[PDB]
């Protein structure tokens, strides 16, 4: 678990720690969620996104499959778990559940 | 001097939260039934096997090359047909991940031979695998959170029993498979969740 | 992978409404008696046979070349001596009509050897036949509505049990014979109808 | 197809009033005792035999060459020591008179060997005879009204049982003998008459 | 059973349907009774008679062992059973229980 | 099941889908009934008919053993089942239970 | 035809007052004890023997060459240590006096071998004798009134039982012996007398 | 039992019906009693007597061991039993219990 | 004719106060316990032996060359640890003194082998001796008053039982030994004395 | 038991009936007691004495081991038991329990 | 004559406070549980061994070359997981110190083979040693106060039982070992201390 | 047990009765406590001391491992137990529990 700390109202990268290839990205489902509340999904190459986090997150796939949180707020503080699944034998096999915690200093 | 496992007892009062097993099913289960779950435990050649039958599912979970034997189990039914299984062993003598094989046979509805029979790597620390075999099409999703940090809040521990759970993130391993496009909805709503302690512990 | 039938259980909670069997009798039955019906089930070489004795009738119904075994039965007495039998199996694995043989022996009144012993073609889709044999002159009419769309409204399903019924007209088959000029008065008045669950299920 | 007799049952609910047997005795019986009468029935080679022991009398009645077996009996005590026996069989398959042999042994008072051992012709239609043998001097009169038109008004039929009685004068046969100058006072006063159902039916 | 019907205030024969000889009549007990209420007895050749029916019945033994009811009334309407017994082995053996019903038209 | 739809106050054929011969019609019992309430019977060649539907139905035996509903009304809307039985071994054997549903547009 | 004795029964309801046996004892008995008397009966080669043990006395009374077997007994304690025994058989088939042998062994106090062992002639009609043998010195007087005209007024007959007693002076026989100068004070005061029915009848 | 009847105020013999010899009378106890109330005793040749019957009874041993009741009264009416015992094996053996009943006509 | 002893019974109601046995002990007994005393009796070759275990003492008392067998015993605890034993036999057939042997083994406290094993002459009439053997040091004093004139006033005799005691000074014999300088303080204070009847009598 | 009777206010000997020698008297414990209330003790040759009976009793050992009661009173009436024990095997063996009763005539 | 040990009994009422055994454990015990302790006693070749299992500990204490056998035990749980064991034997026949061997196996938590297996000399008078063997790492401290002067104030002695304890400092021996730096905190707080009597005494 | 008695306000030696060497003193834990209330500890050569007894006790190790109580008071009266443990097999083995009682006379 990576306790990344970062100052308020700043671009905030959250590393998933798992590298997926762009050919494999169509067959791999990636989604981020904090405190069991969903944040963004990348289901079969579709970058769907939640209304709480539509306009302030940018997915950088190459840099450890990360989200960059723009204009970070204390409401965004918490534990983000990054979930990655791969399609095997007509079943999505979960392969990554890395948890990172973001703390807000103001 | 080396720490060992004690000889087996009729009743165990020191329970260790080893695994949070959640199985989603397509057939309907309404709510928790008292006395439904019947579990059988066996510790043979350092392998702890528990076979619990309840709510139309027979779950055969085996932990391999381990120094702890199972003591108890608790099965509860959540909303949207999610079935939550809480499993308990003696104590955590060694701080290492163990290879698991969990066989989930549908015994009452959507009944058949082996459907998946594959290996789920643990997502955290990648040190163990679940050789999971499903005999039937009833199972929709399986989430096995081993050595969980958080005990389910509406699990009422039996009196004169003592619960210990792992408090380290370095020890918890999650095994997950979903057979339908469910986005891991194995996460129960937990609003109407109740837990019943199994028989033959 | 192919869907199979589960191994038999002592008690089954997933019931499927397979057949609405109505038998009219000339001898008098007043009303439903609790604990009257005693049923025995056997699944041998893909054939589901149920033998239920109640209200002076022994009904031996066999479904041939099927993947479902009987689970339960319910026998009720209607007005004008109509006897309504609700039959239940595990689940509908295959969506095909099955050949049936139903043997209805009068064991208490108007008692004798085989009276009809004939084949009733199913009136809808004409894909199955009932080899129906009546040992006695007590039976006035037989109506066998297999895979019924509508469950009888005053059949109280037992608690902790789950009822599923066919909702497709393409699957319901009606077998009918009337031995007197009755214009198919097997249709019960249903006003005073009650249902009792059979024993040895 | 020919109408037959059903295989025997533990409990029969369809009773047919076959015979009104009245036996007068010189020794004193006060009133009806609940559970006094113990009857045993046997249907061997188309012969229905009933042996009922009660109130100091063992009555062995056998109906020969018949298609009906006995189901039940009821013994009651009237005023002036008259003993009324109501007998029941399955149903009247054939409308013919049958030869009877009724053996009435006094087992408690006025006790001895065979006293009469004679044949009573039936008074109506003269088609049958009662080979009646009395082992003792206790019996004062015997009136056997077979297939009676009228059921005794203060015989309470058991619940969940169905009574049928013959309604034709062409079928009722009366067998009568009186050993004292009694002018056939076997006719009970019926004022204090009660009936108790026999055991081992 | 013979449903004999006959008009009010008339001589009324009621047939027993059993013929007994006069030598056998001393050994044979004959009695008539309607609705279990006794009418006349011929016990060992003694023609005893009940106060309700003393003066209006005449026994004709030869004509089927009958009673003739004189001045018949609706009170006499009912079912008459005729009972005949013969002495065998120190016991009176009943041999006839023929029932006839008389109806009164007025 | 045939969902025949037809406009209000019009002649309305309801096909049974079973063809019987006129020699067999004397031995075959045909009756129509909607919502378990009986409509017409053709028992042994006798075209008996119910008071609700006396004057507005005509049986056409040849055209798939049909009824023609005259001046159709929304009360006639419902599911009509057509029941045909044949006499075999002193028993009427049911051979047809075709259901058709009539809908009324007004 | 000859009147016989019936085969033995478990319970007899027709009792005949055969004998009023009164035994005076020197040792103290206070009052009647419920369930004290235990009687055993045997009818072997036309001899009716009854052996009743109660209140420190074993009384073995045998009636020889008789057609009646004992049915019951009743033992009561009177004032001045008089013990009254009421004895019952089936019925009086023959109107003749029978030779009796009554053996009265003291089993609890004043205990020894045979003390009298003599023959008491019956005082009325002189047709029978009592071969009476006393094993002990406890017995003070014996009065045996056989076939008594008068039943003891404070003997409560059991319900559903029927008592018959001899009403002829030509049939009653009195056997009497007094071992002390007592002037036949076997006559009880009867003021506090109660009777208890014996066991093993 | 002898029902001896005799008129009021008269000598009244009551027969015991048992004859004892005068040598045997010393070894034989004789006593009379009515309604279990004692009347006279002859114990070992001693003719003891009760205050109710002191002066009106005379024992005649030879004439069937009788009492003669003088001036008989209705109070003397009742059943008299006569009891005779003989000494055998250190025990008085009862040998006579004849009962006679006296009735008083006035 | 000679007076004998009766055959043994399950329950005896005629008790004879044969001996007042008082045993003082150094170890503490608080008060009488209901059901504590368990006695066993045996009459072999005219010797009456009673073995009663209670309050830490097993007392084996044997009366030699006697015609009376023991019937009952009663053990009570007095103040200053005095233990009072009341003993009962059938009856006193012979008026002679009998030689006794009483063995008092301490079974719970101050436990050992034979300590005294000597003969106590009876102090009154000097006609008998007590061969008394004590297995242990627990016993402080023994007073055995045989055939006592006075029954202990707070001994409640059981109902339906009859007590007889000797009333002659010529028959009472006292056996006494004191092992400490106690001046025969075996005499109980009797203020808090209660008596419990022994078991297996 | 000796019922010795003696007049009031007189010297009163009470015989024990047991003779002990003066050599044996040191090894023998003798004590008198009436109604379980102790009177005098002679324990190992020590003539101890109770306050009720200090000045009116004299022990005469030779004359059957007696007490002589001086100025006898009705309070002294009762049953006196005389108890003698001898030392055997470290235990005092009781050998005499003779009871005498004194009655007072006044 | 020499004082011996009595033969064994089913129930003993004379208890002697022989040892105050206190065992501290690292695993959590909340409070005293009624019926938890199960003890087994054996006296073989003058060696008194007691094996009591309770609260996750099996304690096998053997006293060698002794004349007293164990009678009872009482186990209670104090604050800070201190476990207090009170042990009882028959009586103290000899006033000498005895060599002891106490084996304390952890049977439920912190479970393993022999950890210490050493000899503790008694600190007072140095006349005896405790060969103490611990099978596990659960035990933190052991304090064995043999023949204690003071009984624990909140130990409720059972009724009808008698407690005796040593009152001499010359007889009490203390055996102590602490495996952690605890400064002998085996001394319980005794505030919430309760005691339960063991089973199989 | 040594009952040492000593007058109030005086130096007061309390003997432990166990002699330990100064090389062994580092491996031996000695502590004194009265009525289960701790007084002083000598844990691994560190002479720690309780606030009740800081300034009035002096440990003399050589003279039987004693404490000297200065200005003794009746509050110091009681039973002092002296506890000595030695390190054996990674366990402190208790070897001395001598109890002495101090009494204060004033």
Author numbering:
A (entry chain J), E (entry chain L), F (entry chain K), H (entry chain G), J (entry chain H), L (entry chain I): 35 to 140
B (entry chain D), C (entry chain C), D (entry chain B), G (entry chain A), I (entry chain F), K (entry chain E): 20 to 220
From the paper:
Here we reveal that MPXV M2, co-existing as a hexamer and a heptamer, recognizes human B7.1 and B7.2 (hB7.1/2) with high avidities.
We finally determined three complex structures, M2-hB7.1 hexamer, M2-hB7.2 hexamer, and M2-hB7.2 heptamer, at an overall resolution of 3.04, 2.7, and 3.12 Å, respectively. The resulting structures reveal that M2 forms an oligomeric ring structure with B7 proteins binding to the outer face of the M2 ring in a 1:1 stoichiometry. M2 binds to hB7.1/2 side-by-side via β-strand complementation mediated by the C-terminal half of the M2 β11 and the N-terminal part of the hB7.1/2 G strand. The long C-terminal loop of M2 sits on top of the shallow concave surface, formed by the natural twist of strands G, F, C, and C’ of hB7.1/2. Extensive residues from the C-terminal loop, β8-β9 loop, and β10-β11 loop, and to a lesser extent, the β8, β9, β10, and β11 strands form a network of both van der Waals and hydrogen bonding interactions with residues from strands G, F, C, and C’ of hB7.1/2. Specifically, residues E122, K123, F126, K127, R128, and E133 from hB7.1, and residues M120, R122, Q125 as well as N127 from hB7.2 form hydrogen bonds with corresponding residues of M2 protein. There is a total of 12 residues on GFCC’ strands as well as CC’- and FG-loops of hB7.1 reside in the CTLA4-hB7.1 interface; however, 8 of them are also contacted by M2.
